[PDB]
Amino acid sequence: SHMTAVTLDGGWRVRLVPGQEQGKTYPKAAAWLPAQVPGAVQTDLIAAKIVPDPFYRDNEGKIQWAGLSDWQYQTRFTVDAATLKREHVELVFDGLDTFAEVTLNGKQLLSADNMFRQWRVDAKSLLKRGDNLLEVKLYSPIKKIQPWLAKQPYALPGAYDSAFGDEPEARHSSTYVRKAPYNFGWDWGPRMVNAGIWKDVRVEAWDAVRVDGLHIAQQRVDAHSAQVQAQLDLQAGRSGPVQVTLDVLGPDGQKVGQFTQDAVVDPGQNRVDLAVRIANPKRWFPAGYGAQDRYTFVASVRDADGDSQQIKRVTGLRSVELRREKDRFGKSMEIVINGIPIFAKGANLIPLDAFPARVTHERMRSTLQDARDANMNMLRMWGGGHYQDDYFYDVADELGIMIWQDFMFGGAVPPYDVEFRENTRQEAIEQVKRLRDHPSLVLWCGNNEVQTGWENWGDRVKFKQSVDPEERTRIERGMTTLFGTVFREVVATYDSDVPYWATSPGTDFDGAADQTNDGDMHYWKVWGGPALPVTEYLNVTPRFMSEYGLQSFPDMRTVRAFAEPGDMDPESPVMRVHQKFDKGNGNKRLMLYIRREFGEPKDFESFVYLSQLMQAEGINIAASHLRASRPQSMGSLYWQLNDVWPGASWSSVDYYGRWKALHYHARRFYAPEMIAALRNDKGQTEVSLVSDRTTPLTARWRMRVMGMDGKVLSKREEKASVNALSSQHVGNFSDKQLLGSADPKRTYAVFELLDGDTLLSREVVFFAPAKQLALPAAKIDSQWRADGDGYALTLTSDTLAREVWLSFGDVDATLSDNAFDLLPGEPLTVRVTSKAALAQLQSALQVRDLAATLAGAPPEP
Amino acid sequence: SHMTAVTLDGGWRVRLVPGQEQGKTYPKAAAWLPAQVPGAVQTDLIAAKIVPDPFYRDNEGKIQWAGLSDWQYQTRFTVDAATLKREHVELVFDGLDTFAEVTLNGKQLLSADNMFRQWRVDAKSLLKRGDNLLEVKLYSPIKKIQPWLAKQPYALPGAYDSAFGDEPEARHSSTYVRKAPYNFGWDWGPRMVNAGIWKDVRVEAWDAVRVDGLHIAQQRVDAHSAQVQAQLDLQAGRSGPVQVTLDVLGPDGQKVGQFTQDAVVDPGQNRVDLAVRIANPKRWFPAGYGAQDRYTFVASVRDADGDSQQIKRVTGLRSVELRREKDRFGKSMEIVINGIPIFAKGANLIPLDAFPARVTHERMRSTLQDARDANMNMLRMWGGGHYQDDYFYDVADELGIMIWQDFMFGGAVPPYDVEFRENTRQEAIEQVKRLRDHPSLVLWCGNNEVQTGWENWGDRVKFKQSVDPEERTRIERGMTTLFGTVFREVVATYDSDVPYWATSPGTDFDGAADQTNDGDMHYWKVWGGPALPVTEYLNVTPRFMSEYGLQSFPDMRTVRAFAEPGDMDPESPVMRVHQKFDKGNGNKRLMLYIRREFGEPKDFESFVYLSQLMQAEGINIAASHLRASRPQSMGSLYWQLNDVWPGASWSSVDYYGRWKALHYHARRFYAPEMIAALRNDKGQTEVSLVSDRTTPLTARWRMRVMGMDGKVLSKREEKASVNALSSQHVGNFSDKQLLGSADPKRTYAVFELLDGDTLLSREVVFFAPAKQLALPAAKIDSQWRADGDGYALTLTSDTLAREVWLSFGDVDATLSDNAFDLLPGEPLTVRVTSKAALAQLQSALQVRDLAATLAGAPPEP
Ligand SMILES: OC[C@H]1O[C@@H](O)[C@@H](O)[C@@H](O)[C@@H]1O
Ligand SMILES: OC[C@H]1O[C@@H](O)[C@@H](O)[C@@H](O)[C@@H]1O
Ligand SMILES: OC[C@H]1O[C@@H](O)[C@@H](O)[C@@H](O)[C@@H]1O
């Protein structure tokens, strides 16, 4: 009979395992309370109003006890006679976080110890007709591991200390458990050591054959043909004939062809492979390089009892090559898609929430749409988080956002015992199997920063030199095996047509990590470490930059969402709670960078804005430099894209999906055709024309040197033929070739790139820190007009207006552009999209600019 | 038209590359001399009488200059107009040893740097009609590498020093080149740093499609069914239709089924898979566990231009599992074939000649037949040699000799550069692809002794502690990547159904190497190191013993083959050359073990015989112990099986295929049903019954304690039901439960295992070293009788006669048994096979026994 699958998302309740100190302290949690599946006991507590929202003000501490406690889930469910007559009946847990003991009708069913693994167990023996009682006990990873850890000769160098002191310093349990690293707190997120059934639970029943998977293995793909192999993986309880039918539909939906294969399956696993050749394929390309065409593979399996079953895969035909060849700059690192070398433009992706089980499809999609809108073509799913929901990868496929997929290791030195290795191997197999058919997934990576940490971080270096050399060898061997062998083999076996990368940053264990002439780099000498000036970005040029960034505050709307009017000061206890860099004392670093460029902010609202400008302009410099240095560099992924929480971070989009100034800048410096004018610390401005086109660009570029009084000092226009997929230097100007005798504090330069009379890109360059400039007081005129859905807002400034920031108080609105420069007498129109009426928008409109913000600023302390 | 292939095995000639010092010194080599291909310039020189046979007496040194020289090969070959019309014309080199520069008609063709790789190159442009000149220059690996090595901060720990001083001590070039390690000399072989085109060269021409391989991929195999996939690999120059037919024949030649697959191929590589399911397969079993049944898969390809091509594979269906499970003794290591745990019985296989290109098919077959006849089921092809000829593996398949296949790394610490790694990777891919379809190949192993050397050998320990810790990490990472990742992936990708083993001995990088409770072991505390007594074998019991051994001299006939009557003294200049252990003082180690048991040999012939008895009895102890210890141990592979040259070694069969006493003993202690009676150094004799049967054994076993005067002291017989695949201890007897009051120097014990009225196995036990025994003067009678081809020779001794050795001077004859014990009045018949006449065999017959040999012995020094 038809394979049946019933989800158990009803009647769940949860309570503290009896006998714990937390039970006495929180008696409401000692009693049964409603529970959501999927969910977390933390959010169950919040929903039952037992604890306040941990995101709000300084409530974070008030929920910490939950992650130190043991929890007991319970649900009852009924199984009908047809289901119990079936030859196979199983319970499936897609996600247990993390140390779980499951009982069914009072006897043992399952032991689970990996947040990222699927657990299938034969339940038929233990099930009864009518009412069944399913219980799931979850144990605090901290409470379970710490007693063991305290007796060990050493604790492995881990991640972050507990700000609440419930784990010893430098003795982190997080290292020893397969659980999302960021749960234990990070320098942009709260400590939420979640416990929960955080994925679906199912009762599944089948008779002759269970279809366990379909994988469209791409053997070779080019313009002329695609040769693939549909691989059906079939679990059979008894030997017998099956017949497989395969329909292939193209991007439009028409049948591409039909294929059939008879086979005899035997008890256990069986693979039935069907070869498919697609002439002149409509291939899948990343964003900006074509369409995101996808084919649909539909397999039908009829078993020995005449029962038919369907399984579908929506996949994209594409070749992927990680090209590493020797050249002038050492050894390249290029993502090549369909024979096209793609300069990776994007950012690092972290979880969308501190509580991942409640993340909506809406937010998953808008996060990717954000990336697409800022002209990105790649996101790196950073290894300190969790593997995303299926739907996330679906939208990624659809939008053409390539995914650099870390396995979920975030920097901690892993233990080298076999059991941890084999536990992790099975995790890798299941995730690779689940995600491999997504065309957007173009690279697997073993971890984030483990090697570079081992080699470059003070604590790692001291540790590895403190232990006996033979113990050091055991530890290093464990890492090399896990990240060099185990993960590589899983990918080579199950997702063979995409490359693997031992560690980010690194050279795939060829040599040392974080090199400038081989592999990728995480550059944090700006912001972190010595905290060098942002112009130092111009002196660093790796073959691929996979991390770098600057911090900023979220939107004013987001600030008011977690803070009250009395809290509006970066040094307030509430703002410090929401600043997680450098043990809560992050503002000092943030203020270092703000003051450098803009001096001392007049008020809290100016502080937030200036913090965002600091971040935006700093990253603008680096990204433009990287792109302009092609083919020396071939990748820019800034830290970070998104937030898990309302608070200060390196994101360009905050927790509520609100664009910072950086994200608006990102669209520009990631634009397919871009002009880069970068003035370094020697007073030299290098101008480059960047084109990601696969065709030549017949361009013109202008250069105008302006007094801040409106007078033009010089005007220049030149022709340029930019090659496809390239960067061309068109000029290099000293300060004195530009200003001559003119005062650098009172002069600026405008750079424009054109195609015919269409302005493709523009950059405004200054010759002194903004705080020293004599910026003009701008009179900005604004006109409104309905335009389709929302409104067209036209801004016109009489003078130069730097970094114009539009906002509307608590009236929600999106803009097609923001944080832009207005040039004298040149009107700019931006699309306002809002549920609000025009009159409301007009009344609520606020127009901020750099000159007005700096005006009246107090001195630096 | 049909693919054509012309082998270039004719007109080859070779000479010193002009401009070398050797050209002046060896002018005969400066001028052209005939060259055989395949071959080596060394054997070319010998054939041209430029140097004498290096195997004979002490001539080894006279050919050393060849390995320090550069050589120029040349051959002419004709190409007709028809071959030049072809769409593709390529030259293929199956074996270049090693650093090769190839030119064709004076133009650059190929650079090669790996003895074990196949080189295919597009030659069509460079060819002309009529005579073509192919030139191959080969460069001495020593001459090429040493100048570079001399400038490096360190030399990697390698292999053996040069006895001729043409490489600095502990600075070996051999580590840095992919070349058979034993070529550079070993402790059982001469230094023959061969240069040569040592495998075939072909000109191949084809049009539409070239068949590049056929692989019968075994997906799952059991009693009920075998599911396989014939994988046809096709290189195409242009897109077009192909047609594939597959015929499958069962073990006698029956049609089991026929299959077809049409496809369109595209430029480059193409995969055509045909699924095949064989109901109730006749599976391949190793020797002693069933038949060696094989199926023949015959594939035919017809392309788009009407060209038909055929490829055949002879393969055996078998499941293979390396089972490692936790038990009382740690973690097991057992080879499981078709669900049957096989106790591995065998030895380590090394190259069959110092010049591998001249090895005959006959010698390949007799070596494996040697193994089969001595009741072995596995040979380990040791990593210091070379991957064998195809024919060797065919015979292995046929005879049921499992092959433990080392990759050809012999112990040296490899360099960690990418270039060496990728060169080695392609080597691994080609060798695995070449050998994977042989059912006898049941395990791949990364190397011999690299890890255990690094951890336990004094020089390695000092070296690794001598470099900066970061440099140590680089070297270790290179090893772990090469042996843990690269080889593993190659095996997992191309030969998925057989296990991989990082290093021998080791725990597959799970932990340290050479453990007693995990993985396999090379035990050399006996013979090597402290040179402990052979009874220490009874105190060492690893989960798998993959190396152990004792040295001995070859047959007297073989000795006379390399030495003259004046050379017959272990300390003579010739015999020292032929002793390669411990540089020049190997004789001291050998005499230590001989003197321990037998005192001082009276003459050279007694020395050879006693050296062989020492070896045979010593290995008997260990091998019997290991088998009797099941399931603690599950493997016995003694070092070594064979020789590369006439001389002293740890072999049981010498260079001319002549059995030592050890091989005759091997047949007995590897027998499927065996009785082990082992007396330890504490005066305790443990008796065990060993059965490799897959069915119960209803046995009786006897024990008799005898005076050397012939009187019986006691007689005992017991019933026993021995379980399948097991060992059963049936007794443990003190010296005093056996002898009571009797003098241990004048009494012995006989242990026998019977099934019904058939004697399966016997062991004779003594209670004191042989030199201290009062063995009786044996009068041994001999009777001859014709039977078909050879003769039946019946031996009858009036008293106990120990270790009787039959020989016939220089008259060649083989024996069905030798080196046996004769019991008083009990006749033994051995079959003599010889071309000789009866009268001459009778005249030439020499019969030696232990007592007569010890009689007249001089005192020890
Ligand atoms: O190592 C410093 C940076 O490294 C990244 O991988 C992230 O962990 C960031 O949150 C962090 O600021
Ligand atoms: O090949 C890598 C390098 O190391 C050794 O092999 C030497 O032969 C060098 O000539 C070579 O350049
Ligand atoms: O190292 C001692 C032994 O190790 C083995 O691997 C072989 O190389 C033997 O020739 C040698 O006697």
B220 to A269: CB separation less than 8 angstroms, yes or no = yes
A462 part of contact set with chain B, CB < 8 Å: no
Q: How far apart are CA B280 and CA B277, in angstroms?
A: 10
Put simply, whether B715 touches A (Cβ < 8 Å) is no
* Separation in Å, CA of B148 to nearest CA in chain A: 22
Question: Ligand 1: does its nearest atom lie under 6 Å from the Cβ of A186?
Answer: yes
Q: With beta carbons less than 8 A apart as the criterion, state whether B446 and B382 touch.
A: no
Domain B317-670 has CATH 3.20.20.80: yes
Running DSSP on this structure, what letter comes out for residue B552?
B
User: Which chain A residue lies closest to B279 (C-alpha atoms)?
Assistant: A264
Q: Are A764 and A821 in contact (CB under 8 A)?
A: yes
| Inter-residue contact B92 to B118 (CB < 8 Å) | yes
Alpha carbon B343 to its chain centroid, in Å, reads: 18
Interface size between A and B, measured as CB pairs under 8 A? 88
B224, B271, B476: residue with CB nearest A473: B476
Q: Do B488 and A493 touch (CB under 8 A)?
A: no
For chain B, give the longest Cα–Cα distance: 94
What pairs with residue B381 in β-bridges? B349, B405
Nearest to A225 among B227, B266, B493 (CB): B266
User: Which residues from chain A sit within 8 angstroms of residue B494, using beta carbons?
Assistant: none
Instruction: Classify residue B504 by its DSSP letter.
Output: B
Q: For chain A, what are the domain ranges?
A: 1-207, 208-316, 317-670, 671-769, 770-861
Determine contact: B511 vs chain A, CB below 8 A. yes
CB contact under 8 A, A484 and B480: yes
Closest chain B residue by Cα to residue A420: B510
**Does B9 contact A at CB distance below 8 Å?**
no
User: Which residue from A minimizes the CA distance to B496?
Assistant: A493
Tokens of A87: 């030859």
- Name every chain A residue with its beta carbon within 8 A of the beta carbon of B473: 476
Q: How far apart are CA A131 and CA A182, in angstroms?
A: 39
Q: Which residues of B96-114 are buried (b: 16+ CB within 10 A; e: fewer)?
A: bbbbbbbbbeeeebbebbb
- 8 Å CB contact between B263 and A277: yes
Element (H, E) at A730: strand A726-734
**B357 DSSP assignment:** G
Ligand 2 atom, smallest distance to B417 CA? 2
State the distance from the centre of ligand 2 to the C-alpha of B143, rounded, in angstroms: 12
b/e sequence B800-835, b meaning 16+ C-beta within 10 Å: bbbbbbbbbeebebebebbbbbbbbeeebebebebe
The number of beta carbons lying within 10 Å of the beta carbon of residue B179 is 23
Kindly state whether B492 is in contact with chain A, defined as any CB-CB distance less than 8 angstroms.
yes
Chain A residues whose beta carbon lies within 8 Å of the beta carbon of residue B268:
220
State the DSSP H helix or E strand holding residue A5, giving kind and residue range, or none if neither.
strand A4-7
> Closest approach of chain B CAs to the CA of A332, in angstroms?
15
Q: Which atom of ligand 1 is nearest to the CA of A382?
A: 6
Residue A223 contacts B, CB cutoff 8 Å: no
Asked if B519 and B508 count as a contact pair (C-beta separation under 8 A), the reply is: yes
What is the amino acid identity at position B480?
A: T
Q: How far is the CA of B163 from the centre of ligand 2 (A)?
A: 24
Q: Give the pair of three-digit tokens for residue A18.
A: 């009896």
Best CA proximity match to A370, nearest among A662, A722, A30, A684: A662
A492 touches chain B (CB under 8 A): yes
Say if A271 is an interface residue toward chain B (CB within 8 Å). yes
Distance CA A624, CA B411 (A): 51
C-alpha–C-alpha distance, residues A760 and B597, integer Å: 95
Let me know: does A262 contact A314? Beta carbons within 8 Å. Answer: no
Q: Which amino acid is at A405?
A: Q
DSSP state of A545: E
Q: Where are the beta strands (DSSP E) in B105-182?
A: 107-113, 119-122, 130-139
Sign of torsion over alpha carbons A594, A595, A599, A601: positive
Where b means 16+ CB within 10 Å and e means fewer, B586-598 reads bbebbbebbbbbb
**CA closest to B493 among chain A residues:** A493
Method used to solve the structure? X-ray
Single out the residue of A139, A155, A119 nearest to residue A193, CA to CA.
Answer: A139
Q: Is A661 helix (H, G, I), strand (E, B) or coil?
A: helix
Helix (H, G, I), strand (E, B) or coil at B617: helix
Give the dihedral sign, CA A422/A425/A431/A432: negative
Please say whether the beta carbons of A485 and A505 come within 8 A: no
> Is there an atom of ligand 1 within 6 Å of A448 CB?
yes
Atom of ligand 1 nearest to the CA of A384: 8
Residues in chain A with CB shorter than 8 Å from the CB of B471 are none
B497/A contact by beta carbon, under 8 A: no
Task: For chain B, state the CA radius of gyration.
Answer: 29
A260 touches chain B (CB under 8 A): no
Sign of CA dihedral B151, B153, B158, B160: positive
Biggest distance spanned by C-alpha atoms of chain A: 93
Instruction: Burial-class residue B19 by CB neighbours within 10 Å (0-12, 13-18, 19+).
Output: exposed
User: What is the C-alpha separation between B506 and B502, in angstroms, rounded?
Assistant: 7
Task: Find the B275 Cα to ligand 2 centroid distance in Å.
Answer: 46
DSSP strand E in B595-746: where?
Answer: 635-638, 673-679, 684-691, 697-707, 712-722, 726-734
Q: How many whole angstroms from B527 Cα to the centroid of ligand 3?
A: 11
Which residue's alpha carbon is nearest to atom 8 within ligand 2?
B145
Residues B188 and B649: beta-carbon distance below 8 Å: yes
* Inter-chain CB proximity B484 and A481 less than 8 Å: yes
Bond before A38 cis per omega within 30 degrees = yes
Which atom of ligand 3 is closest in space to residue B549's alpha carbon?
A: 12
Query: Which residues in chain A have their CB less than 8 angstroms from residue B263's CB?
Result: 275, 277
Atom of ligand 1 nearest to the CA of A524: 2
3-state secondary structure of A63: helix
Resolution to one decimal, Å:
2.1
Contact A366, A657 (CB under 8 A): yes
DSSP state of B482: I
The CATH class, in words, for B1-207 is: mainly beta
Q: Phi-psi category of A650—alpha, beta or left, where left has phi over 0 and alpha has psi -120 to 50?
A: alpha
DSSP assignment of A259-279 equals: EEEEEEE-SEEEEEEEEEEEE
Locate B635 and state its tokens: 């493997």
Tell me, yes or no, if A466 comes closer than 8 A to chain B by beta carbon.
no
- Set of chain B residues whose Cβ sits within 8 Å of the Cβ of A485: 484-485, 488
Going by the DSSP 8-state scheme, the letter that residue B658 receives in this structure is P
Cβ pair A463, A154 in contact under 8 A: yes
Extract the tokens encoding B778: 């044996």
Residue B725 C-alpha, separation from nearest chain A C-alpha, in angstroms:
27
Q: Distance between CA atoms of A380 and A402, rounded to whole angstroms?
A: 8
CA–CA separation, B280 and A818 (whole Å) = 73
Burial label for A805, CB within 10 Å (0-12, 13-18, 19+), is: buried
Which residues have C-beta atoms less than 6 Å from ligand 2?
B 144-145, 148, 176, 419
CA angle at residue A611 from A672 to A851, to 5 degrees?
85
How far, in Å, CA of A457 to CA of A450, rounded? 10
Is the minimum CB–CB distance between B472 and chain A shorter than 8 Å? yes
Q: In angstroms, rounded to a whole number, what is the distance separating the alpha carbons of residues A828 and A795?
A: 5
Which among B219, B476, B511 has CB closest to A476?
A: B476
User: Look-up: residue for tokens 């995303």?
Assistant: A388
DSSP-derived secondary structure for B9-58: -SS-EEEEPTT-HHHHH-HHHHS-EE--SSS-HHHHHHHTTSS--TTSTT
Q: What is the DSSP letter of A375?
A: T
Query: CB–CB of A271 and B509 under 8 A?
Result: no
For B792-852, what is the HEC assignment? Answer: EEEEEECCCEEEEEEECCCCCCEECCCCEEECCCCCEEEEEECCCCHHHHHHHCEEECHHH
